[PDB]
Amino acid sequence: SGAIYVGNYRVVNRHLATHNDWANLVWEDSSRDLLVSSTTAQGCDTIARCDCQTGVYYCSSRRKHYPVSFSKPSLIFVEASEYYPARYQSHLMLAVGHSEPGDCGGILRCQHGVVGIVSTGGNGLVGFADVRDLLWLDEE
Ligand SMILES: COc1ccccc1-c1nnco1
Numbered sequence: 286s287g288a289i290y291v292g293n294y295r296v297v298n299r300h301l302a303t304h305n306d307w308a309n310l311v312w313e314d315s316s317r318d319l320l321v322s323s324t325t326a327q328g329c330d331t332i333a334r335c336d337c338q339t340g341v342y343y344c345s346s347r348r349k350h351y352p353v354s355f356s357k358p359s360l361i362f363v364e365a366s367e368y369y370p371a372r373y374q375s376h377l378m379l380a381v382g383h384s385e386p387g388d389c390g391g392i393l394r395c396q397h398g399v400v401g402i403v404s405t406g407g408n409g410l411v412g413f414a415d416v417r418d419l420l421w422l423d424e425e
């Protein structure tokens with residue numbers, strides 16, 4: 286689990302969104318596993334605006350933050366797992382690292398702020414849903 290709280294937005298994995306998120310929907314995209322809902326209180330997370338490929342992510346299944354190199358946001362095949370079917374996911378970045386389903390929502394951060402959230406895993410890779418292209422999270 287986990288979310289990004291920027292301005293009056295809450296950013297979550299689409300597959301973990303709650304009824305409240307859907308009842309306060311701003312934007313969602315199945316292809317990216319992202320959903321954004323509106324918040325009553327202002328958040329303080331800063332979204333990275335950059336093309337960094339190094340950062341640190343939170344892995345809840347190890348209670349650890351790991352430094353990682355990560356790839357460019359791309360359209361990648363995600364294999365079937367115990368709880369989820371095989372599908373293509375867009376705006377996905379991969380790193381070599383540990384990820385289990387319950388790690389979804391863990392923050393990836395660089396020196397510029399939040400890059401994205403854990404979204405996929407398998408075969409010793411961790412996949413992150415990028416948010417750095419969603420420039421509107423910074424306004425309105
Ligand atoms: C961090 O995510 C995973 C790690 C391992 C296996 C599957 C997943 C996953 N796939 N879709 C959602 O979670």
Ligand SMILES: [Zn+2]
Nearest residue numbers: 335337395397
């Ligand atoms: Zn950066």
